[PDB]
Amino acid sequence: HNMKAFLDELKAENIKKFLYNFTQIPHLAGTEQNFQLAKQIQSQWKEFGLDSVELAHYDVLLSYPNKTHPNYISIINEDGNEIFNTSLFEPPPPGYENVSDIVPPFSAFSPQGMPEGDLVYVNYARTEDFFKLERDMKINCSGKIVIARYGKVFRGNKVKNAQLAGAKGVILYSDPADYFAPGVKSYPDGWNLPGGGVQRGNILNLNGAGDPLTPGYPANEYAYRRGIAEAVGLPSIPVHPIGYYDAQKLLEKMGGSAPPDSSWRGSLKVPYNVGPGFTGNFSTQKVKMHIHSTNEVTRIYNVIGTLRGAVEPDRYVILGGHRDSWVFGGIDPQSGAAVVHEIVRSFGTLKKEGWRPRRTILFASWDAEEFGLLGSTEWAEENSRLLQERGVAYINADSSIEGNYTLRVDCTPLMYSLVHNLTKELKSPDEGFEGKSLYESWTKKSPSPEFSGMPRISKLGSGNDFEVFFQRLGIASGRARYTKNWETNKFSGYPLYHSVYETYELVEKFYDPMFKYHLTVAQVRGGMVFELANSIVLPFDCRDYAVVLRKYADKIYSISMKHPQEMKTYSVSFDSLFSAVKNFTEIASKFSERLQDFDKSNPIVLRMMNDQLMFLERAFIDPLGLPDRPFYRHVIYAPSSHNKYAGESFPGIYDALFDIESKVDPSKAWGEVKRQIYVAAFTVQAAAETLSEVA
Amino acid sequence: HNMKAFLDELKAENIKKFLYNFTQIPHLAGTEQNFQLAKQIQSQWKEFGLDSVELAHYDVLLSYPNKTHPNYISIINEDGNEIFNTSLFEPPPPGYENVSDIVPPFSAFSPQGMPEGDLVYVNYARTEDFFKLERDMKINCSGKIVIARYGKVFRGNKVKNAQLAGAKGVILYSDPADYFAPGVKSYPDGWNLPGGGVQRGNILNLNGAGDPLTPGYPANEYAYRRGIAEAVGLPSIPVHPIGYYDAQKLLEKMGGSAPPDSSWRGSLKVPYNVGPGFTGNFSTQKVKMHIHSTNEVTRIYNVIGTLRGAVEPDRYVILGGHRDSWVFGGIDPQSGAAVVHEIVRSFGTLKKEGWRPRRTILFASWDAEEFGLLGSTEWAEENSRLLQERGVAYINADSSIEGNYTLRVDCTPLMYSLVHNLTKELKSPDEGFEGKSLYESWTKKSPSPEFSGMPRISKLGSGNDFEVFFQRLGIASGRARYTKNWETNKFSGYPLYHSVYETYELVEKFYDPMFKYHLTVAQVRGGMVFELANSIVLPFDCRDYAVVLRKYADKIYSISMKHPQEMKTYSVSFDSLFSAVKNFTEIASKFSERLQDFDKSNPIVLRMMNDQLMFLERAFIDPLGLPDRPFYRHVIYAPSSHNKYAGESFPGIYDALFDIESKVDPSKAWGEVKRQIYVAAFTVQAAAETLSEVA
Numbered sequence A, B: 001h002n003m004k005a006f007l008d009e010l011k012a013e014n015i016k017k018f019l020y021n022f023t024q025i026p027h028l029a030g031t032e033q034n035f036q037l038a039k040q041i042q043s044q045w046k047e048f049g050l051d052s053v054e055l056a057h058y059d060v061l062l063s064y065p066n067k068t069h070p071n072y073i074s075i076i077n078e079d080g081n082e083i084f085n086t087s088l089f090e091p092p093p094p095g096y097e098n099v100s101d102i103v104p105p106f107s108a109f110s111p112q113g114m115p116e117g118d119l120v121y122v123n124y125a126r127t128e129d130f131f132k133l134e135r136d137m138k139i140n141c142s143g144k145i146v147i148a149r150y151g152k153v154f155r156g157n158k159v160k161n162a163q164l165a166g167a168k169g170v171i172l173y174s175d176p177a178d179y180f181a182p183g184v185k186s187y188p189d190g191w192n193l194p195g196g197g198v199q200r201g202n203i204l205n206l207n208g209a210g211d212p213l214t215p216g217y218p219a220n221e222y223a224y225r226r227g228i229a230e231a232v233g234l235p236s237i238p239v240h241p242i243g244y245y246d247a248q249k250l251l252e253k254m255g256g257s258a259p260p261d262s263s264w265r266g267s268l269k270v271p272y273n274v275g276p277g278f279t280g281n282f283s284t285q286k287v288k289m290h291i292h293s294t295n296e297v298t299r300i301y302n303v304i305g306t307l308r309g310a311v312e313p314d315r316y317v318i319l320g321g322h323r324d325s326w327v328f329g330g331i332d333p334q335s336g337a338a339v340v341h342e343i344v345r346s347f348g349t350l351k352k353e354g355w356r357p358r359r360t361i362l363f364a365s366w367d368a369e370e371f372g373l374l375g376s377t378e379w380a381e382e383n384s385r386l387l388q389e390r391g392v393a394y395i396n397a398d399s400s401i402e403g404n405y406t407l408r409v410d411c412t413p414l415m416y417s418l419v420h421n422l423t424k425e426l427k428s429p430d431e432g433f434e435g436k437s438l439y440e441s442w443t444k445k446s447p448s449p450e451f452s453g454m455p456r457i458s459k460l461g462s463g464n465d466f467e468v469f470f471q472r473l474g475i476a477s478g479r480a481r482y483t484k485n486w487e488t489n490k491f492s493g494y495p496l497y498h499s500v501y502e503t504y505e506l507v508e509k510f511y512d513p514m515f516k517y518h519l520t521v522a523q524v525r526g527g528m529v530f531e532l533a534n535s536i537v538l539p540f541d542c543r544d545y546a547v548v549l550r551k552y553a554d555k556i557y558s559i560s561m562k563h564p565q566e567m568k569t570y571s572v573s574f575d576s577l578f579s580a581v582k583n584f585t586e587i588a589s590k591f592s593e594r595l596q597d598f599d600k601s602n603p604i605v606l607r608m609m610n611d612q613l614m615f616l617e618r619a620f621i622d623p624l625g626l627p628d629r630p631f632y633r634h635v636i637y638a639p640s641s642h643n644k645y646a647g648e649s650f651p652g653i654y655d656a657l658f659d660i661e662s663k664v665d666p667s668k669a670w671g672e673v674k675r676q677i678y679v680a681a682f683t684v685q686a687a688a689e690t691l692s693e694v695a
């Protein structure tokens, strides 16, 4: 029919029931229950009316803790008496004491070992916090157990910095300064992190490789696997996460140097000292880790469902999201999985009455996402030759509500206006916004930092099941969800992230009692897919890309001009990049002018223009990729190696310019800067030339 | 109209006049006369009726000899008196004594130097001829001036082997055993190589990189060029070619070990001794080279003409060929350039009367081909993002007549059938074949070594302006020309290849007096392009690819089974490759069955199927390329690193298996073999799934 029938066919009660269904038993990747959930989801997707549902399985390397040999951290005296022990598991939430197969918290892919030695507080384990240790405080943290805190960076980056500094082991804890909202009670009577709550997650640095043992090719049965000595991204030291009830015991006895400033402090009742070892008599005590987790090749299943396109069955529009969890996944991911179920149940309801999308829709329940985005990456490695020539756009559907204040959208500039349009025709659940549109609430609560009256749309980064589609293949992608207040709350994620307390009751009683903030996210994702696979002309705008390209060029130019003297000695010129951006602007303007003087009743010319729009995003892909990152190939929006969390666009030039005043050879560094300027300008002009008149 | 009007619009007299025009003054790449020829060809192509003709210029690294410091080889005694000197130039052909700007023979990109030392005969400078030198002769040729002979390998491979063996310098000469047909007189009264005739050509090993200073990106003006220390493929020792009048003087005084066998011997009146140094008193004499050629960045222009497609202007069908020569280029390349000019004129004659191709045709007069395929490679590097999605197929047009006996076609298996059909509807110019078709003569003179009644079509290798289009981008390509007798003549190329004697009179009086063997090649290339850009359904057949894939898999398996013991210790299995080939066969059969039950009046489905056919070739492209060769990306037909001249398909597995019994670690070598089997099987299966029914 139209979107007026698809959007009003979604129900909050169906999402509620799907969340209840998916959030009662553990569904860790590679387990029996995850396979049972995959089979049940396949059956339900077949019943809803999908054209074909299949289970694509890959034998990928996963990590599990030993059920007989638990992992724990201890405080060891001179005689090895283990005077302190940390918790082997979190206290199960009420109503879940009899639920079996609950894996204890663990850092996935941590090597086995028994490290012993002194403790060094490292704060957030960033490059800034490791510079200060030896540059300023003269602390050598090599051979010592490094204890960091969650936040401000990815876990893999923390472990990588710890290895680069020579640490024997890594301990992670959730400080109540970053994971405890003020004036809120713990999970049983609130939504704050309890003291036994521990956050899980992998510590892998894959850089878009996927399964570590098969980089570049899928992990089918007839596959040659690298042994675990040349594997991609595996750490070399054991890691284990804890709560702030055991971390207090670990930190309370620390001694040595005082914290450098106030930012090297939290909300615990400890001095937060940095100096290696403990204080006083406790100086004769050290920390001993007991990590027994093992890596093994296990089979993971992705549920791939197809809805054939009526006019262009080879044009693939993908709505994907993962299915595996850590314990229960109340928000991450089953808050998104339940929304996906409703999206392809309303799609199935429209299909039953005889509706067919104009372009083929691929629905995907991925797997092994908490292990390095393995399922989606393997599937896209197996299907790259079809995705490159047939992938119109991708829509990621992870956790639906990390908050309850306002919407948050991260998409490519090609889908900005479309997003805005879809946000204008919808409604807002927020109090004081009844009878309004989601556009008004999203703009007022999240205004653009540059424009006035425009909502803020962030950048598409990495770390979810869109990295392979966007940063390696070059398919336009998009995320939409509901998040916290950007100013009043101001803490990382949500307190119960990757926790055993991330259950259904949390969402039902504290996050989304009426499942309205789930319904709105379901509507935005579904209508994103709907006007991404049914519009005659693809809803893509290149002038937004031109504007953001000019802005990014200005930002990179200012960052470079922060060093004006070296820009003059080695003749570093940004004129090529600015000229490329200007030509992109002009060619985009002329292509948009042709887009409004072209008859749409001709299938062939319509295909020409839609292919131009679809391969616009493809044209920013460098076949050789980024330096030392062959699978990060997006020239504009690839993650930067030096930050990877908040990095500016043009990652090549930003990486070249990063810490440029710290390299021994300045001529070589500025030659690298000039080479990246040349590559960026060539890529921008090449992407502009794809919108030039076709021969 | 049709091909009935385009084929009989070509004339032999127009080709004759174009060949006369293009072969009176020297046109070397990067010179004033080559630029004048480029401008004149641009003007004539505009006059014929091309839709848009432009001059795409790139500043690439070329090599030229010093006009004040000539290069020559001398025999130097103990006192440095230079008792012998080789020729500084070849005797100009009659009627060309007053022609200026004749560059003397030189090996392009040879480093400057004055090496001295003893001479070591090395025969054809292949890997076996260097194996024998120390394995059998106990002869160390490090620090020795290596003298080889043209043939059996590429010049760059000879120089690479010489560097790998430690030679100070390389001397090349044309043996009258390989470049002197029996019973034929020299060029003024025949077509045999004179004593002063010298063959030119580059000695670069670029492996598909293109311009050495800009690998992966075009050489525009805003380009960061690598200095000449990290340049791609540049040799490290001076090289100079000579004729067999001076090589006799160099070789006649040789001494030392006798030649291995009869194959280490030519037609000269010299003992062909291998031993380092000279014999007798001449042992106190050595060889001194005087190489002064310099490398510099020069601007090269490619003439790019566009004839818009009537129905699918996006779809590019390219007819390309280079324009630069060495002295006059009577056959190489202006025998092909004059044919290209006539094909463009015949296309323009139909264009004037109102005919438009269904798909866009790109005509290309490339440049700097004798320097490493630089012009075409730079143009395709600048236009890769359009070629990968719009390049239907490519047609190379180099030298037209390498001989006068029978046709020779080298194409991808997708264009086998079409070629046969085009060869059936044409005529045969050979004597005793009047009133017949080119099919009969081509089959009888060149029968298939496997089938009966089918003409022989060889493999698409490398070394011309199709390597970038085929072995990196993945565009179906084709070559058709006239060559010598495969068995009765049996010598390399033609005697006057890359010579100053390769003039217009040679072709007019000894090779093609009536320009009928030029007309047939013009017709086959023109009709190759015609039913490649005008047929409703792309004239591509996948079952030929399936059959040749089965044959190549059988050949690689038979090569591997020469080591059955190691195939069992390390569990080397080819079952994956054979299963992939079988699935490709089945899916190709089913897709071909859908190709004959599909209504062609629907533009959208026609586009779907033609895109499937066009991207069939693109599906064999590995994004990561071959080991150590990032720009050789065709999985099936890429050149092999160990032979590069006569190597079997599946180059990855062939290079893995090459000299496998000579590696210290056998487990690692067979693991590499298994990895290449896995990659090949995955690529075959993936290319099969592109012809599977769309979602």
Ligand SMILES: *[C@@H]1O[C@H](CO)[C@@H](O)[C@H](O)[C@H]1NC(C)=O
Binding pocket: A066, A067, A068, A069, A294
């Ligand atoms: C778990 O630990 C026990 C005790 O050391 C051991 O026997 C068992 O093999 C381990 N499980 C593994 C390695 O999967």
Ligand SMILES: *[C@@H]1O[C@H](CO)[C@@H](O)[C@H](O)[C@H]1NC(C)=O
Binding pocket: A074, A081, A082, A083, A084, A085
């Ligand atoms: C810590 O755990 C170890 C291992 O079970 C045990 O031997 C030790 O007694 C424990 N110590 C404390 C203080 O709980």
Ligand SMILES: *[C@@H]1O[C@H](CO)[C@@H](O)[C@H](O)[C@H]1NC(C)=O
Binding pocket: A191, A403, A404, A405, A510, A511
């Ligand atoms: C939901 O929003 C209201 C409005 O301010 C807030 O008071 C409440 O804490 C929010 N619930 C959460 C964040 O779980």
Ligand SMILES: *[C@@H]1O[C@H](CO)[C@@H](O)[C@H](O)[C@H]1NC(C)=O
Binding pocket: B066, B067, B068, B069, B294
């Ligand atoms: C050619 O050689 C002469 C004599 O050594 C020299 O002066 C001139 O610069 C050379 N030409 C070059 C290097 O282009």
Ligand SMILES: *[C@@H]1O[C@H](CO)[C@@H](O)[C@H](O)[C@H]1NC(C)=O
Binding pocket: B074, B081, B082, B083, B084, B085
């Ligand atoms: C060889 O050439 C050099 C350089 O011009 C000259 O000095 C010498 O006399 C020549 N020798 C002979 C034998 O021609």
Ligand SMILES: *[C@@H]1O[C@H](CO)[C@@H](O)[C@H](O)[C@H]1NC(C)=O
Binding pocket: B191, B403, B404, B405, B510, B511
């Ligand atoms: C052309 O073909 C005839 C027929 O055999 C042959 O005698 C003649 O030598 C050929 N001309 C060449 C090869 O230039």
Ligand SMILES: [Ca+2]
Binding pocket: A209, A210, A211, A213, A214, A215, A216, A217, A218, A219, A377, A378, A381
């Ligand atoms: Ca993989």
Ligand SMILES: [Ca+2]
Binding pocket: B209, B210, B211, B213, B214, B215, B216, B217, B218, B219, B377, B378, B381
């Ligand atoms: Ca280049």
Ligand SMILES: [Cl-]
Binding pocket: B396, B397, B398, B399, B464, B479, B480, B481
């Ligand atoms: Cl050719």
Ligand SMILES: [Zn+2]
Binding pocket: A322, A332, A333, A369, A398, A399
């Ligand atoms: Zn998630």
Ligand SMILES: [Zn+2]
Binding pocket: A332, A333, A370, A498
């Ligand atoms: Zn997660």
Ligand SMILES: [Zn+2]
Binding pocket: B322, B332, B333, B369, B398, B399
């Ligand atoms: Zn040529």
Ligand SMILES: [Zn+2]
Binding pocket: B332, B333, B370, B498
């Ligand atoms: Zn040539």
